[PDB]
Amino acid sequence: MPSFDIVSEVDLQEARNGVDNAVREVESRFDFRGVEATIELNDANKTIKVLSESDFQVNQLLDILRAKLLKRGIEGASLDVPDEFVHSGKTWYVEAKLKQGIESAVQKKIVKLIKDSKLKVQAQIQGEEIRVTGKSRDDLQSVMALVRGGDLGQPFQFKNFRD
Ligand SMILES: Nc1nc2c(ncn2[C@@H]2O[C@@H]3COP(=O)(O)O[C@H]4[C@@H](O)[C@H](n5cnc6c(=O)[nH]c(N)nc65)O[C@@H]4COP(=O)(O)O[C@H]3[C@H]2O)c(=O)[nH]1
Numbered sequence: 001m002p003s004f005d006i007v008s009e010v011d012l013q014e015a016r017n018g019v020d021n022a023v024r025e026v027e028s029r030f031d032f033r034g035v036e037a038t039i040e041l042n043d044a045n046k047t048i049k050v051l052s053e054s055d056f057q058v059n060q061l062l063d064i065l066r067a068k069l070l071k072r073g074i075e076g077a078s079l080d081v082p083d084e085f086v087h088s089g090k091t092w093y094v095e096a097k098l099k100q101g102i103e104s105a106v107q108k109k110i111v112k113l114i115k116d117s118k119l120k121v122q123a124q125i126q127g128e129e130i131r132v133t134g135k136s137r138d139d140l141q142s143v144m145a146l147v148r149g150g151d152l153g154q155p156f157q158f159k160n161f162r163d
Pocket of ligand 1: 033
């Protein structure tokens with residue numbers, strides 16, 4: 001009874017290091033000297049708030065944070081940036097969501113998408129991931145390519161291959 005796990009992981013310590021290093025980089029940049037510019041990781045909600053004084057400077061901070069994150073092994077696709085920036089007072093900010101684990105809403109689409117493929121596999125939501133089982137190892141490879149090549153909004157890896 002072959003099975004594997006569909007997971008979406010980011011080492012949160014590496015993320016914190018990226019933020020820490022993005023902050024040290026902003027403090028060196030003299031286009032930001034004496035400019036309100038902050039990057040704060042909320043480790044409860046898996047979110048990074050980046051705030052500055054213009055929407056242009058917010059994107060500058062996001063690009064710095066993404067560069068630092070990539071070097072720590074975290075890919076830009078793991079940092080969900082919402083459509084709307086917030087204009088509050090003389091500040092601009094956005095809450096960027098770190099896509100660690102597969103949220104309930106995305107698990108449903110993965111399970112639905114696997115259903116509509118007609119492959120003889122079962123897909124069971126388990127904690128923060130999806131276990132997939134079936135009798136054919138090759139059908140199990142087809143769902144990997146199906147998930148890989150989906151636009152699901154997030155990187156996935158596959159772990160825990162069992163027979
Ligand atoms: N982008 C920008 N920010 C400004 C400006 N003026 C003041 N600030 C901000 O306000 C901080 C304190 O300025 P300060 O009281 O004169 O206290 C400063 C000041 O006494 C001196 N300093 C730094 N740069 C200069 C300079 O270019 N000329 C002179 N005469 N002193 C400087 O060293 C202190 C610490 O400097 P900072 O750490 O950078 O921290 C500075 C800086 O972040 C400005 O014209 N442009």
